[PDB]
Amino acid sequence: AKLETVTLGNIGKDGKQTLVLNPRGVNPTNGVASLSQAGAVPALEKRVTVSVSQPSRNRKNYKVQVKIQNPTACTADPSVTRQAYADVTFSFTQYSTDEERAFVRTELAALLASPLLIDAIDQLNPA
């Protein structure tokens, strides 16, 4: 599919905050797509990047990489104080079925909302 206004609802603490996004072109150099929020500041925008990696003669392994980054706002023109970014990398073999990849993706999505992970992330309590 192409890039459209990816909208997310019922998100965050208390499960009420919503987030809208807009396409921001595709960089053809490294084959990376980019998203952003509607704020009019180049360095205070939520950014979502997705990409693939066709197998080369040096890798022979499909790679799907999704990155997220959120900056912070502090007024002292507001500046950026803290970065908080996360990376997701999938690896698939040439003979990976559709069922296998979909299963991996959706079980990661479901397990990411499990109480173990929310206590391992929000309060950083080791398992």
- Gaps in the chain after residue (C–N beyond 2.5 Å): 76
Site for another protein in 16-35 (CB under 8 A): 16, 18, 20
How far CA 118 is from CA of 48, 77, 83, 110, in Å, comes to 21, 35, 20, 12
22 binds, among a second copy, another protein, none (CB under 5 to 8 A by kind): a second copy
Report d(CA 108, CA 39) in Å as an integer. 30
Site for a second copy in 33-62 (CB under 8 A): 33-36, 38-44, 48, 50-54, 56, 62
125 binds a second copy (CB under 8 A): yes
Contact (CB, 8 A) for 46 and 37: yes
Site for another protein in 82-111 (CB under 8 A): 102, 106
What residues line the site for another protein (CB under 8 A)? Answer: 6-7, 9-11, 13-16, 18, 20, 38, 40, 102, 106, 113-115, 118
